[PDB]
Design a protein around this nucleic acid. Structure first.
Lengths: 324, 98, 225
RNA sequence: UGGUUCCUGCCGAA
RNA sequence: CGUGGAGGUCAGUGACGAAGCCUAGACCGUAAGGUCGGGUCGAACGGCCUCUAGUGCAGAUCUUGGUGGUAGUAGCAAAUUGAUAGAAUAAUCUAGCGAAACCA
RNA sequence: UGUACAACGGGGUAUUGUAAGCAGUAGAGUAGCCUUGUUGUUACGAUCUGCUGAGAUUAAGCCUUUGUUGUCUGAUUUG
């Protein structure tokens, strides 16, 4: 392949997994921001391997997961020339993150982005509800418009990212009504992704050669960590009350007070990068897919140097008191 | 021109060698203070024995390069004119054979 | 009329205190001499600035401390061939210490004071003889030319008097043998005048040492000890 | 060896 | 058919414009060509019957002159009190000057 | 003109390995002083001990900031 640079730093999802209309209406991908890498102790459950029922130490990558919010939908009708959106539907109240995304000079603009669109709910909704019933009627496939809570993130960019997600639940009408309830509300990955899920990662890699869109597939999610948990770094074996945040935090990133996904292996791109987490394009059954992993211990030490503790309470407990 | 700077350099050195040694020391003091003032002021003072000669040597070497190149280009022009005359002679000899 | 600031030597680049002086001199000078994004200087390069610098800069500044004695030195240079002037420091002051000694609302931070500073010579020279040594008078006149020619030349009726913000003064008493460079940010009292001053950055005092060639240690032109 | 200066009509080979 | 000159003739034309030039102006000739309009122009020139010839060109790598591209190119003594300047430290750019080879 | 930005400051994390300076009976010994010692003690004494994981660095591409301080603007283009 000719190595030309990426178009956008938010990499495109060129293909989505297959629509099952017998499952409830649910998302198919997510956009998070990778914090960094650490090392996880767990037990291997692999008969046929000599390392069966044996402690393995594994490199993982953790992506910060702010809860994503839906602000619009887009229905595509089939043409003999390809997919084409007949329209897009927006919600009324959109944040300055998203109105910032449309603008290049937000700091001096009069911020006039979706003003007259807000007059479209000043009415009963007749044009808007006509459009919703149109996307019920036409537009065989449905994509939803989502953006992240980037202010809840140590990113210096206050401008959140918008993306489309193909909605592979059932019933296009129930899909657009589902999105209609889910306008301006939130969706966490706990209703979308789960433990042991084989996911694919779509991300622009590290420029220096580089800065190319890459899709690395078949990565087992190891932890769907909740933001309210203070035992994010804990296990049933590791009974410390500690977070997933490293000692000193993630290097050049900040922290994760939000939800997070800890996934096996490595991933294209660097830290501070927008990464799409897509579920698998097929039902992998490789027994590397079916594995219900069970963690044991989480490294949360410093990568800012050769770390030697996990909690600072452990640090004071070993070092005792100081002169300071 | 560097020729003129070398002329002024030799004129300054002859004026210094003409005068008395105490006047020489005092004029060297005057020239070092005024020269430091003009240099730190911003006037690039360019008067050296070796450097002005080496600038002349570089200019002479460049002109020698130019002479070699132009002489060679004239030789190649004469070569091409001779070869085209040879071509036309051969065409005339073929047409004399026909 | 651009300018440089570098600390020369292992002892200089070893000192974190002298880095503060480097930062503050970078904050004092004009936008044309704003060397900024040259904070990270290298261990490898040692008098390597003279090869790439005079493509686009003049008037280099050197910091050096002797390995034997606990004294650190300023040198003032030209990137074309000229003189250098060697100075010992006196009473090095941290600008953050001037913060904590006296709190003043400073405009070093904002980009509104992205403007060149001005020239005040507090009796640095005497055109009169005043003594038996006229070479000292020549020293005074040459260094006057230095400070008026490091900064951009100001034929004053051409100059726009809107930008005043940075001002700079060199205090020379003849009996002390001491030159002191203290600069202030200006404030305007609009009375048709009256002008306030506030301290901004490093306050110093120097001592004349020697005059060499603009290439450092090239030709020692004047001794003063 | 190469070149060898206006038109039209008529006759016109090897 | 056209050109220079010569004899005769048209008591030919001509400063109220000859000759020459131009003419996205008209006309007559099969053509060689000729006639007129208009514009420019300033001093000579034509038709007819004859005579006479240094009398008709696209070429001859023809002669001479003029002008192209090459090309702002090569390149900077290529021709031009002493020498292309300016900047890069007194070790690439701008500025200035500026070819030839060759060319159904 | 704002959880706004920035210079400081603070806290966190990591690096190096006990800073300067104070005290000593610790110090192989040499003189010195008598109260010639059953550690009698006073001077020099590389070093050692306590103050002391002390002191120094810490983002220049680490993290955070209810603390301080200042800031917010011109040139061009389009129906």
């Amino acid at each position: 392949l000719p190595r030309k640079r990426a178009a956008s730093i938010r990499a495109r999802v060129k293909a989505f997994p297959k629509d099952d209309r017998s499952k409830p209406v649910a998302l198919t991908s997510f956009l998070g921001y990778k914090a960094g890498m650490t090392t996880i102790v767990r037990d291997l459950d692999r008969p046929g391997s000599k390392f069966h029922k044996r402690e393995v130490v594994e490199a993982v990558t953790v992506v910060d997961t702010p809860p994503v919010v839906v602000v619009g939908v887009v229905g595509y009708v089939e043409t003999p020339r390809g997919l084409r959106s007949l329209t897009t539907v927006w919600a009324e109240h959109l944040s300055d993150e998203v109105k910032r995304r449309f603008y290049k000079n937000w700091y001096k603009s009069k911020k006039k982005a979706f003003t007259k669109y807000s007059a479209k709910y000043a009415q009963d909704g007749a044009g808007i509800e006509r459009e919703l019933a149109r996307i019920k009627k036409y537009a065989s496939v449905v994509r939803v418009l989502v953006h992240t809570q980037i202010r809840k993130t140590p990113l210096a960019q206050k401008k959140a990212h918008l993306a489309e997600i193909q909605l592979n639940g059932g019933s296009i009408s129930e899909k657009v009504d589902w999105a209609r309830e889910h306008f301006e509300k939130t969706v966490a990955v706990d209703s979308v992704f789960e433990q042991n899920e084989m996911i694919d990662a779509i991300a622009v890699t590290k420029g220096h050669r580089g800065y190319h869109s890459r899709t690395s597939i078949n990565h087992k999610i190891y932890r769907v960590g909740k933001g309210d948990d203070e035992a994010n770094g804990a296990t049933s074996f590791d009974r410390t009350k500690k977070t997933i945040t490293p000692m000193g935090g993630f290097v050049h990133y900040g922290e994760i007070k939000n939800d997070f996904i800890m996934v096996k292996g490595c991933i294209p791109g660097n830290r501070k990068r927008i990464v799409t987490l897509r579920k698998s394009l097929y039902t992998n059954t490789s027994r590397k897919a079916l594995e219900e992993v069970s963690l044991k211990w989480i490294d949360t030490a410093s990568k800012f140097g050769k770390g030697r503790f996990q909690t600072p309470a452990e640090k004071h407990a070993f070092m005792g008191t100081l002169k300071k | 021109d560097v020729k003129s700077h070398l002329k002024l350099l030799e004129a300054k050195k002859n004026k210094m060698e003409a005068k008395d040694e105490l006047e020489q020391i005092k004029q060297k003091e005057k020239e070092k203070w005024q020269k430091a003032m003009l240099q730190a002021e911003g006037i690039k003072i360019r008067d050296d024995e070796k450097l002005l000669r080496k600038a002349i040597k570089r200019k002479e070497a460049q002109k020698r390069k130019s002479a070699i190149e132009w002489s060679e280009r004239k030789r190649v022009v004469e070569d091409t004119i001779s070869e085209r005359q040879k071509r036309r002679e051969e065409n005339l000899r073929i047409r004399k054979d026909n | 009329p651009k300018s440089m600031v570098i600390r020369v030597g292992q002892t200089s680049l070893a000192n974190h205190s002298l880095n503060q002086l480097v930062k503050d001199f970078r904050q004092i000078m004009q936008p044309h001499t704003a060397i900024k994004l040259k904070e990270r200087k290298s261990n490898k390069l040692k008098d390597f600035v003279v090869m790439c610098g005079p493509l686009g800069v003049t008037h280099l500044f050197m910091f050096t401390q002797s390995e034997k004695t606990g004294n650190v030195s300023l040198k003032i240079a030209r990137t074309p061939q000229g003189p250098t002037v060697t100075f010992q420091v006196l009473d090095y002051s941290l600008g953050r210490d001037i913060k904590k000694f006296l709190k003043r609302p400073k405009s070093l931070n904002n980009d509104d004071v992205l403007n060149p500073p001005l020239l005040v010579l507090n009796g640095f020279s005497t055109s009169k003889r005043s003594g038996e040594d006229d070479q000292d008078v020549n020293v005074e006149k040459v260094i006057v030319s230095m400070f008026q020619n490091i900064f951009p030349p100001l034929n004053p009726a051409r100059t726009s008097l809107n930008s005043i913000k940075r001002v700079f003064m060199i205090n020379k008493d003849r009996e002390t043998g001491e030159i002191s460079m203290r600069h202030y940010f200006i404030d305007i009292r609009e009375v048709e005048k009256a002008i306030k001053l506030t301290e901004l950055g490093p306050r110093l005092t120097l001592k004349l040492v020697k005059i060499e060639e603009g290439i450092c240690s090239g030709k020692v032109l004047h001794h003063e000890f």
